[PDB]
């Protein structure tokens, strides 16, 4: 399935090149510009655990997730991954725990030491 495919066929987008965040571009977005640090970014997403459970989805909530890029308001994999996206892009990210919730996990949804899969669509980005 898609998690296996990005595990086996994804590109390492980390600065350390430690394969902690792998990416596949599923739909090419618009132009060449990616957001900048501090931009308000709007995304749709779904997240799955490595046991197949869907732990989160903005689509199911009927509202996007909104955060300021590069500020640690989301897991490290999202700060790094969304920073690579163009407006309108859809990507898959495969995130080792060191770029996600680590040994702590995040109750009730996410166990300790969890590798996570996301599908993310960058809807918009704007400076404030």
The class by helix and strand makeup works out as: alpha+beta
Percentage of residues in DSSP E strands: 25-35%
Largest sheet, in brief, is:
7 strands, antiparallel
CATH topology, by name, is Chitinase A, domain 3
Q: What is the CA-atom radius of gyration, in angstroms?
A: 14 Å
Number of strands: 7
Principal-axis shape: globular
Q: How many discrete domains?
A: 1
Describe, in plain words, how this protein is organized in 3D.
- The chain has 128 residues and is α+β, with helices and mostly antiparallel strands.
- The protein has a single domain (1-128), classed as Chitinase A, domain 3 (Roll), CATH 3.10.50.
- 15% of the residues lie in helices and 34% in strands.
- It has helices at 2-9, 58-61, 76-82; strands at residues 11-12, 21-27, 40-49, 54-57, 65-68, 90-95, 116-126.
- Strands 1, 2, 3, 4, 5, 6 and 7 form a seven-stranded antiparallel beta sheet that branches.
- The protein is globular, with a radius of gyration of 14 Å.
- Keywords: Acetylation, Chaperone, Cytoplasm, Isomerase, Nucleus, Phosphoprotein, Repeat, Rotamase, TPR repeat, Ubl conjugation.
- One of its GO terms (cellular component) is nucleoplasm.
- This is Peptidyl-prolyl cis-trans isomerase FKBP5.
- GO terms for molecular function: FK506 binding; heat shock protein binding; peptidyl-prolyl cis-trans isomerase activity; protein-macromolecule adaptor activity.
Reconstruct the topology from this structure.
Blueprint: H1 2-9, E1 11-12, E2 21-27, E3 40-49, E4 54-57, H2 58-61, E5 65-68, H3 76-82, E6 90-95, E7 116-126
Antiparallel strand pairs: 1-2, 2-6, 3-4, 3-5, 3-7, 6-7
PDB class: isomerase
Keywords: Hsp90 cochaperone, immunophiline, isomerase
Assembly: monomeric
